[PDB]
Design a protein around this ligand. Structure first.
Ligand code: HAS
Ligand code: HEM
Ligand code: OLC
Ligand code: OLC
Ligand code: OLC
Ligand code: OLC
Ligand code: OLC
Ligand code: OLC
Ligand code: OLC
Ligand code: OLC
Ligand code: OLC
Ligand code: OLC
Ligand code: OLC
Ligand code: OLC
Ligand code: OLC
Ligand code: CUA
Ligand code: CU
Lengths: 554, 167, 31
């Protein structure tokens, strides 16, 4: 087509997107079987017939975590947070670099995947030493992640070129979001990169004998918190700058949207000890400081809740809805593009509430390493982030391919989205409630059927969620491939503009925007906070290293 | 106009919401601070680094003889040296008196395990080469189950232990 | 005035408090 000659960035974006959804599908296959497990039903003998390379529950669990939480979410982030700013500025990104990023991602995936498939790295997506995976797993994971440094370069390049042509102008809203997003990720990424380079790689190749597990976990959770905000912020970008148009209204505030993203730049990285409240050898004072900073990282989503609800109420009133609740009925509940993230946002209320409990230092001892935790995070990433990505089939995919969505495909989409959402809610009840009964996460509980009798009722919810989400996944697969493999094309769809929302403006807004646009300053503040929050403890740990030998227990 | 008046009113309420939010977060900080000043804070692991060699811990030192792992260190205080390993706890059972402060000192000779005492706030990660120290006082006598709540290999789901609290 | 947006943030606030105070109580019951 001549459309990809003018807009080659459409084709690269599509490749990120498709690869990402294939990952989501393969990783999600294991979910229903894990849910049935948490219902005391053992369906793994059947799964091994279908997929004979699967040797255990925990190998299935590794694939699930890696493919869904690391691979799908990264590739979605890379697609959304490069292509959207490019389209807002109407400038082409460096296509050499953009293709280089895709090939790094694809090669790292293939390399990591092989030991995963051969039962050589059954260590879960957190890969905590001294459990020792195959070298290809760590090498592949490292190359996959480093792919993002090239994306960071590509957006900073776009931003700089725009500033050179538009001196004295404030950064446009979507591009401001992406620049602070990618700068945050650079700082965030250093924990894992350092862990891999100084420790996991030399160790897996045989160059050093052991690894200190405490320093490894500490470096991991430097990256391991801000990675979940890395997963979230692409959906937020869509929820702020695209969803309001789809609802029939406007974004009620540019500055409040900018402020939320800015707070994420500052507060997403210096908080990882909230994953280490139960670790020895880290001072309680530091745990409290990180606990306090974790409660502050809640503020931008508290802020987000009001700004987005007010935007949707505004759209609802424009479409003629009256009273307390009539604005809701007037929203376009027949469009899957609107419905999917909104359901996502509803489930994010209990999801966020659980997060705040988890952050509260001593309250974490009630719920740490129980089923509660997967209950929390499926509401966040497996519902809101994933559902937002699913809705983008219905506006983004035609914009990239020229393939229209039929009315039947629309209707199917509405079913998939509702069943997925309802499935996650049912599971959330079962896992939260089981967690309070002391049922552990990361456990093949079905193989010890008499061990948790007190949890018989929440287990029924887990079985049910298991089968509901099986049906939703099957319908999704069918729906995705109906759109992709469809014969009909319409190039006028690929040349149309993206449905960016308009903004309501106030005299206040320009003074605020200028202060927020001093991105060099704000980046420097975020770097210093990481150094203060992490430096003193790392100096102490590197001073007293105690490396220990590796083990293979699978 | 309609839209400008909407911008103004929305923002007016949002400032209220933000002030309320901060107030609520500050109250949670105070309530957490309170827990750090009571006996219930004993379950926070010690922050001191206490290194050991995981290869010799079954041959030499306080974990080598599990029948002598329970030691009176105070007038109403006992210290318990616990080994979490693939796939069990030693001693089994752990026997301690009710009403006494119990200092648990937990290490592993292999991989990371969890130590979660069902019915209590004891819920600590156990790393090889390092000692996890937590304090608790058992109020009720009876049997409490220990659950490994960190993935530690294929035996993980069957790795349990027992504490017996004697009248 | 944005009555609807306020109803949403009320629901969120109640959820946060029920979660947080319910777990605070469980913490003291097990301590
Ligand atoms: C995208 C993925 C995730 C997000 C977002 C996330 C948010 C938080 N989490 Fe988390 N979490 C923790 C704390 C938080 C806190 C304080 C927040 C906050 O950022 C949450 C703030 C959110 C809110 C305050 C909600 C705002 C509500 C909104 C925005 C909805 C409004 C609705 C509308 C507008 C709809 C209205 C429409 C109508 C039509 C009515 C802690 C501890 O502090 C642990 C460790 C626990 C342990 O012991 O292991 C943890 C564990 C995890 C793990 C497991 C890691 C592992 O494997 O061990 C994952 C994957 C994860 C993901 C994510 N989590 N979390
Ligand atoms: C049909 C959809 C899904 C179902 C039924 C499902 C079910 C489950 C269950 C029951 C667990 C806990 C198992 C255990 O602790 O042993 C689990 C773990 C997990 N799930 Fe899902 N899941 C689904 C989709 C997703 C998606 C889309 C994501 C991310 C985008 C996700 C991310 C995770 C992660 C990160 C874990 C933790 C892995 C670990 O502890 O090593 N899941 N899932
Ligand atoms: C391993 C080495 C394979 C290296 C891959 C060499 C082929 C690269 C082709 C290329 O860069 O094409 C751009 C894009 O894929 C057009 O669709
Ligand atoms: C994609 C990134 C690739 C990075 C590879 C780093 C390879 C690590 C090589 C570092 C040398 C380690 C070494 O030589 O170990 C000496 C040690 O003192 C023995 O006791
Ligand atoms: C493509 C990249 C190739 C790097 C090739 C690296 C060569 C890997 C061979 C060394 C090796 O696998 O050793 C394992 C170790 O002995 C057990 O811990
Ligand atoms: C903004 C920055 C935040 C600054 C204020 C944060 C509170 C500071 C210190 C409290 C530490 C008290 C920890 C004592 C616990 C010791 C313990 O109970 O041992 C087991
Ligand atoms: C139990 C599991 C939880 C399910 C609860 C969902 C709350 C959703 C509230 C929003 C409902 C929107 C439906 C709607 O208003 O649809 C209008 C329809 O088109 C006619 O005009
Ligand atoms: C009673 C308890 C039993 C357990 C729950 C049973 C599970 C699913 C029921 C089927 C739900 C099908 C959901 C489809 C809803 C829908 O598509 O609504 C479209 C509307 O236009 C708005 O967007
Ligand atoms: C909703 C599910 C709520 C289930 C609440 C379980 C209550 C509980 O945890 O019991 C108290 C304590 O754990 C034992 O001393
Ligand atoms: C609608 C679907 C399920 C509703 C919830 C059904 C929950 C009823 C409990 C079923 C159960 O398993 O019984 C408890 C216990 O085992 C007694 O012998
Ligand atoms: C309602 C969804 C169907 C769930 C039916 C199976 C639930 C289950 O496993 O119940 C076993 C029983 O409670 C113990 O004997
Ligand atoms: C390779 C990726 C390079 C990452 C670049 C981050 C450093 C940086 O440029 O920070 C200053 C900021 O750009 C001020 O405009
Ligand atoms: C007891 C706990 C349970 C109850 C929780 C209630 C939710 C709390 C606050 C909602 C936000 C309140 C915001 C009110 C702001 C009032 C305001 O500032 O509006 C003035 C404006 O200028 C007029 O035109
Ligand atoms: C507008 C009004 C302005 C004033 C608003 C002030 C809000 C105060 C909130 C919480 C108080 C903290 C209470 C601290 C005492 C906690 C005691 C407790 O929880 O006891 C449990 C257990 O029995 C012991 O071991
Ligand atoms: C729908 C979305 C998902 C729904 C998640 C379900 C869990 C909800 C709230 C948990 C709050 C904790 C409730 C604990 C109550 C127990 C209690 O009140 O504790 C006092 C008693 O003394 C103890 O022994
Ligand atoms: Cu030891 Cu799981
Ligand atoms: Cu976190």
């Amino acid at each position: 087509s001549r459309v990809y000659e003018a807009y080659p960035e459409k084709k690269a974006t599509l490749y990120f997107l498709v690869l990402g959804f294939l990952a989501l599908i393969v990783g999600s296959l294991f979910g229903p079987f894990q849910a049935l497990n948490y219902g005391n039903v053992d369906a793994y003998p059947l799964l091994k017939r279908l997929l004979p390379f699967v040797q255990s529950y925990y190998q299935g669990l590794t694939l699930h975590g890696v493919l869904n939480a690391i691979v799908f979410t990264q590739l979605f982030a890379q697609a959304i947070m490069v292509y959207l700013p490019a389209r807002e500025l109407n400038m082409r990104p460096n296509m050499g670099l953009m293709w280089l990023s895709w090939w790094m991602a694809f090669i790292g995936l293939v390399v990591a995947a092989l030991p995963l498939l051969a039962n050589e790295a059954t260590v879960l997506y957190t890969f905590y030493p001294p459990l020792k995976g195959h070298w290809a797993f760590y090498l592949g994971a490292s190359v996959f992640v480093l792919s993002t440094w090239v994306s960071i370069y590509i957006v900073l390049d776009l931003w700089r070129r725009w500033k050179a042509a538009n001196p004295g102008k404030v950064t446009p809203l979507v591009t401001y979001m992406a620049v602070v997003f990618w700068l945050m990720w650079f700082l965030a990424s250093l924990g894992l990169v350092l862990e891999a380079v100084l420790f996991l790689l030399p160790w897996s190749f045989g160059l050093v004998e052991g690894v200190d597990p405490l320093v490894a976990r500490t470096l991991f959770w430097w990256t391991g918190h801000p990675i979940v905000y890395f997963w979230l912020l692409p959906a937020y970008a869509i929820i702020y700058t695209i969803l309001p148009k789809q609802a029939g209204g406007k974004l009620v505030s540019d500055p409040m949207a900018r402020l939320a993203f800015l707070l994420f730049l500052l507060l997403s990285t210096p908080v990882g000890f909230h994953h280490q409240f139960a670790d020895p050898g880290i001072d309680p004072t530091w745990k409290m400081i990180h606990s306090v900073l974790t409660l502050f990282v809640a503020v931008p989503s508290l802020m987000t809740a009001f700004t987005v609800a007010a935007s949707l109420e505004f759209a609802g009133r424009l479409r003629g809805g009256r009273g307390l609740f009539g604005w809701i009925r007037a929203l376009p509940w027949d469009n899957p593009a609107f419905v999917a993230p909104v359901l996502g946002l509803l489930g994010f209320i209990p999801g966020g509430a659980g997060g705040i409990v988890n952050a509260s230092f001593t309250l974490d001892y009630v719920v740490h390493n129980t089923a509660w935790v997967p209950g929390h995070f499926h509401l966040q990433v497996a519902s809101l982030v994933t559902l937002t990505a699913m809705g983008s089939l219905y506006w983004l995919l035609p914009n990239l391919t020229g393939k229209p969505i039929s009315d039947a495909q629309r209707r199917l989409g509405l079913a998939v989205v509702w069943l997925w959402f309802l499935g996650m809610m049912i599971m959330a009840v079962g896992l939260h409630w089981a967690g309070l009964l002391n049922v552990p996460r990361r456990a093949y509980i079905a193989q010890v059927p008499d061990a948790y009798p007190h949890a018989a009722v929440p287990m029924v919810f887990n079985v049910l969620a298991g089968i509901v989400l099986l049906v939703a996944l099957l319908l999704f697969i069918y729906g995705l491939f109906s759109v992709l493999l469809s014969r009909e094309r319409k190039p006028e769809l690929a040349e149309a503009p993206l449905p960016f929302a308009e903004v309501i403006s106030g005299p206040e807004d320009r003074r605020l925007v200028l202060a927020m646009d001093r991105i060099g300053f704000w980046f420097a503040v975020a770097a210093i906070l990481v150094v203060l929050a992490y430096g003193p403890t790392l100096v102490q740990l590197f001073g007293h290293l105690n490396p220990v030998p590796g083990w293979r227990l699978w | 106009v309609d839209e400008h008046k909407a911008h103004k009113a929305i923002l007016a309420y949002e400032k209220g919401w933000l002030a309320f939010s901060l107030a609520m977060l500050f109250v949670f900080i105070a309530l957490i601070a309170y827990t750090l000043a009571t006996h219930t804070a004993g379950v926070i692991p010690a922050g001191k680094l206490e290194r050991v060699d995981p290869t010799t811990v079954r041959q030499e030192g306080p974990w080598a003889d599990p029948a002598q792992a329970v030691v009176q260190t105070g007038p109403n205080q006992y210290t318990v040296y616990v080994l979490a390993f693939a796939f069990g706890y030693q001693p089994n059972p752990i026997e301690v008196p009710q009403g006494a402060e119990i200092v648990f000192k937990i290490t592993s000779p292999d991989v990371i395990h969890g130590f979660h005492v069902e019915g209590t706030n004891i819920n600590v990660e156990v790393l090889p080469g390092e000692v996890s120290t937590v304090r608790y006082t058992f109020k009720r006598p009876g049997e409490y189950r220990i659950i490994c709540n960190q993935y530690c290999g294929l035996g993980h789901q069957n790795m349990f232990g027992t504490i017996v609290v004697k009248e | 005035k944005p009555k609807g947006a306020l109803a949403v943030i009320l629901v969120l606030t109640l959820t946060i408090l029920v979660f947080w105070l319910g777990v605070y109580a469980v913490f003291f019951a097990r301590g």
